Each structure stands twice: as C-alpha cells, then as structure tokens.
Write a protein that binds this ligand. Structure first.
Ligand SMILES: *[C@@H]1CC(=O)N(CC)C1=O
Lengths: 454, 167
C-alpha cells in the first residue's frame, strides 16, 4: 500500500531500528507485538495503527504518557495523525478504506478512552478540553458520527460531576448512640474490625493511578497530587499509633493483657475479612519499640492469640513472601497493603532509564511505563468489589476522628509512648511495679463469633 | 551454608535513595531493574575473600507509613543511613533515624554506615567535612556515592559488612 511522503505526513516514515524496537514476545491474547521503545511519532502511530486496534497499548499509554509527552502535545499529535493527506483510481479507494478510515477511527477511540478514563487532564487544563471539543466538532463522516456523538456524551457527563442482606451490627458494653462511652474495650471487637475495614476499603478504592504514576506521592507536590493516597496512609498510621497508645497507657498489667488480647481479636477479624491493611496496622503496633519490649504483657496472652499474632507477623517476613502468596490466592473483597505497590512503582521508575539509545537516536523506553501500568492495573483489580457490611455511622465517625498524637509532633509523641513503656515495665533489673486499674467495666471479651444467626 | 547479612536502608524520601541498592544489585552494565522478583534484593558477593549473601531491605516509597519504621528496622543486622548531598534536610534527618535504630535494636552500638548520595547535577549543600564530622561523632564510617557512575556503591555495602563482622 502506497503512503504519503514523510515530508507532508510524519507518521508515513517507515519502521527502523532507530525509531521503534519490540520485545521478543507477543501480547498473550491478541498476537500483537509488544513495543519496547520508540520515538513519540512511532508510539502515536502504533497507538492509532491502521492494521489492528491495540486496547492494551491504548490503556497503558494513556495511563503513563505524561512522563514523556505533555497533554497539549498529545492532543496536537493525534489531531495531526487524523489529518491524513492522500498520496501525490483503485489505489486511492484502497488507501481511504484500509488507511484513512481505520486510523481516523483509532484516534476517535483514543479520544474516547482519554475523556472516559483520564478526564483529570481536561479538568486541570480547560484549554485542553476547548481544543478537544473543537477538534471533535470538525469531524465529518457517517462512519465517524456515531463515535463523535459518544465522545460528546462522555464529556457532558464528566463535566456534570446490589447484593443480599449484610450481618447484624454487633454491640458490646457501649450501646447504640452512646458515643461518649466508645473505646477499644467497650465497642464489640467484631464491629471495630468491620467499621475499620469499611473505612480502609473506601480509602483504598479512592486512590487513582494519577496519584502514583511518576512517583508523585514522594515529590514536593505530593499533597496536591496524591491526596487520597496520603489520607489512606495517614489513617493507617493513626490506627497503629492509637493501638500503641491504648496499650502503653493501660498501666495495670491485667488490664493491659486484656487490651493487647482485644487488639489480637480485632486482627483475627481483619484476617477473616481479608483486610490486609488492618492486619499490618496491628502487626506494626505490636512490633513498635514501645510495645515489642512488654514481655510481662506478652507472657500472659493466651497461646492461641500468640499464634494468631505470630502468623500475622510472618506475612511480612522475607520481604512479604507469605503476604504476596496469600493476596494472589484471595478472593475479593479485600483491602491490600499499599506500601508494596508504592515501593515497586518507585523502584521501577527510578531503576530504569526514561530513554533507550539505538544508532545514536533517543527512543522513549515504553516497557518501563508498561511495568508501572501493570502495577496500577493490579491495584485497580481490588477496587471494584465492595464489602457486604452495614456502615454504623457513629462507630465510623469515632474511627475517622481518632487523634492519638493530639497536638504533639511525631518525635515528641513517639518518645512519650516509649517513656510510658519503660514506666509500666522497667528495663531489667528494675523490679516490676503495680499500678491501679483504670477501667470500671468488665474486661472479658465477647469473642469474635457473631452473637445472633444471620 | 554461607553467611547471610540482613541489611536495611534508612533515610529521607524524595531524594533518590533507592539508587544505592538498585546500583548494587543490578549488573554494572545492565541499566535495568524489576523490583517484583526475589533476585531484586539478594546478592551473593565476596568480601575480603569470604563469600556471603547480602539481603537488602529498602522500603523507598513507604516513608509516609512512619509507624512501620520500627517493624522494618528490627529485621536488620546492619544499617545504611542515607542522605542526599544536595538536600540538607535529608542530612539533618539522620540523627533521628540513628536514634530510632538504637532504640529498635536496644543497643548503643549497632553496625551502621553513613552514606552521602550524589544522584543529580543539583548543587551540593552538604560538604564532605560536615558529613565526616557527623560520622565521627557517632563512631561510624562515612561513604560517598554517585547515582550516575556507581562510584562508592560497593564500598558503602562492603564497609557495612565489615562493621557487622567486626562487631
Ligand atoms: C538525587 C537527589 C534528589 O533530590 N533526587 C531526586 C529524587 C535525586 O535523584
């Protein structure tokens, strides 16, 4: 098939080792080659290829392109790709049907996927949307009309911004509506875990790939670019610190044993719910410097609860080897531990070059971007399925407003927890003091089995 | 069975600290890294004629999970406390990282190395004398490395292993 001159149409330039390179394998399900690297012209040609549609490449590209191409520049490139001149008969009719119509259709599909899945580019740059609406308004053809109309309907929707019965809400000492008595030992341990799981699942689900691609949560504008991720992490830290505070502020040994034991029961329930964020919140508190050293407390914990904690701790051993296997074997709904994804995205981005060189020419390293999009894709697979649990508004609010640090800075609060630890269980050979009881209600747990049949 | 050393990288986020371990683990002519595999954090090496396995924990990206630092730190026998030579705040953060490690390990004498990392062409703000004086106040070695050239990377890790062997 005869194409126009590269002097009048940049995308007609033939493939070479200096402008596009591939991986040895093919896309598993489609039998399409895997692009390793190329110039932006070549990536844009393959993003809107005449021979076949490439939905994986479109998805990966639109998720990661901003590291090598600005939104404004990408729009210009796809507009340029669409405006195909005919070469300088049966050859022209073939070119119209086998090159122009397929390429034009592919750029409309890119526009559609762009506005549908990455509308934040348009929210952040009103002029980008002006150029998109204008471009789309100039598209003529009965073949294109249907796709054009759909893009317009998505833009208007984006501008204007299912199960059976859940289990019964569990109550212990605090009664419904008595928020003033709510605390670690007064709320039912099953319901603490459920409401934290609901909160933590919503926080996980709100994190978008725009908060992760480019390692933006580690950069100076992290508060602007990754607000949902940072909120999720800050809640997690907050709960770990609250668990540690509950423990070290219970000076009486018997009551502290009851506190630690209740936290291990919350952990057991997190494991039942596949709330791995919750599991690791607890494990982190138990391995903290102030808690870890409380041997007199851990000696009195029932053997079964010691074993529950040990198994949870083992999930993190050997660079999360057991956690990673268990998450692969799960079974949504679940709340994954986000930190592993963060480390994998950062090390993928920092550990691989942005550009590859071939015959003295710079090619965008697309495989690096593919690896990041695979991680973000794995995050997204766990964000679709909700939990079949009822929200309890007051318990929810109690966990949202927890603030164990108060007005203190991190070091100050952390030193205070450690000094409380040394006070309640002095460093050997100092004798173990006794302390008065602080809880006027019973310490006995109701256990982690529901109270009524579902 | 050859000796295995569990090393932990600690330091401020946002300043390219991950380059230290990545450069160590990747073959010197392989500009490539996949953190999602076991080989990504383990390396068999020979130090002073004795073959050993280095297991390196670098949680770069997880700095906001500040209540998980003790958990991660307690897995290590030896520590690389890393700062960026172009970021004074990262250097000023070292003191509290070292205090946490000592508290976690319950020891005033933990095998540790101070590492100053040069990872871009931004101006140096931490002079080698400032870092040498800090390392001497703690009684630990100071190693400077480059992310661009791999200079000092091996020396940083091998020095830590010598600190563990001589503990
Ligand atoms: C070296 C120092 C710095 O701030 N960076 C960016 C993350 C480096 O790579």
């Amino acid at each position: 098939m005869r194409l126009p001159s590269a002097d009048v149409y940049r995308f007609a330039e033939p493939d070479s080792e200096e402008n596009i390179i591939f991986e040895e394998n093919m896309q598993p399900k489609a039998g399409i080659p895997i692009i390793k690297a190329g110039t932006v012209i070549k990536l844009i040609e393959r993003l809107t290829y005449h021979m076949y549609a490439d939905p994986n490449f479109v998805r990966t590209f639109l998720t990661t392109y901003r590291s090598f191409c600005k939104p404004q520049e990408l729009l210009s490139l796809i507009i340029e790709r669409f405006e195909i001149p005919e070469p300088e008969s049966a050859e022209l009719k073939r070119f119209r049907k086998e090159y122009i119509q397929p390429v034009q259709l592919r750029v409309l599909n890119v526009c559609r996927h762009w506005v549908e899945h990455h509308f934040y580019d348009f929210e952040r740059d009103a002029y980008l949307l002006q150029r998109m609406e204008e471009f789309i308004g100039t598209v003529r053809g009965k073949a294109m009309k249907k796709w054009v109309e759909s893009i317009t309907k998505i833009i208007q929707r984006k501008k204007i911004a299912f199960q059976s019965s859940p289990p019964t809400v569990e109550w212990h000492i605090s009664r419904p509506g008595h928020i003033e008595t709510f605390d670690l030992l007064t709320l039912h341990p099953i319901e603490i875990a459920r409401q934290l799981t609901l909160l933590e699942s919503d926080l996980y689900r709100a994190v978008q790939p725009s908060e992760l691609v480019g390692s933006v949560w580690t950069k100076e504008d992290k508060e602007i670019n990754s607000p949902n991720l940072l909120k999720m992490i800050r809640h997690t830290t907050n709960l770990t610190l609250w668990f540690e505070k509950c423990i070290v502020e219970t000076e009486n040994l018997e009551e502290r044993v009851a506190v630690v034991s209740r936290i291990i029961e919350i952990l057991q329930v997190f494991q039942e719910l596949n709330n791995f964020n919750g599991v690791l919140e607890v494990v982190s508190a138990m391995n903290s410097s102030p808690v870890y050293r409380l041997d007199h407390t851990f000696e009195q914990i029932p053997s079964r609860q010691k074993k529950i904690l040990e198994e949870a701790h083992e999930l993190s051993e050997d660079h999360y080897k057991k956690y990673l296997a268990k998450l692969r074997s799960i079974n949504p709904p679940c709340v994954p531990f986000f930190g592993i994804y963060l480390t994998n995205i950062l090390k993928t981005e920092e550990g691989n070059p942005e550009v590859l060189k071939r015959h003295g020419k710079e090619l965008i390293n697309f495989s690096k971007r593919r690896k990041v999009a695979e991680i973000t894709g794995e995050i997204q697979q766990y964000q679709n399925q909700p939990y079949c649990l009822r929200v309890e508004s007051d318990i929810k609010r109690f966990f949202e407003n927890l603030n164990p640090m108060g007005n203190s800075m991190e070091k100050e609060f952390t030193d205070y927890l450690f000094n409380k630890s040394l006070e309640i269980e002095p460093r050997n050979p100092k004798p173990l003091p006794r302390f008065p009881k602080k809880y006027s209600y019973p310490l006995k747990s109701p256990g982690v089995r529901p109270s009524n049949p579902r | 069975h050859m000796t295995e050393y569990k090393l932990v990288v600690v330091g401020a986020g946002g300043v390219g600290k991950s380059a230290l371990t990545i450069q160590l683990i990747q073959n010197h002519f392989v500009d490539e890294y996949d953190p999602t595999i076991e080989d990504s954090y383990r390396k068999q090496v020979v130090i002073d004629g004795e073959t050993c396995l280095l297991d390196i924990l670098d949680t770069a990206g997880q700095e906001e999970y500040s209540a998980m630092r003790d958990q991660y730190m307690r897995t290590g026998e030896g520590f690389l406390c890393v700062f960026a030579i172009n970021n004074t705040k990262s250097f000023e953060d070292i003191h509290q990282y070292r205090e946490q490690i000592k508290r976690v390990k319950d020891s005033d004498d933990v095998p540790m190395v101070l590492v100053g990392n040069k990872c871009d062409l931004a101006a140096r703000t931490v002079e080698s004398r400032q870092a040498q004086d800090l390392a001497r106040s703690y009684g630990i070695p100071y190693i400077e490395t480059s992310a661009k050239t791999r200079q000092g990377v091996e020396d940083a890790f091998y020095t830590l292993v010598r600190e563990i062997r001589q503990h």
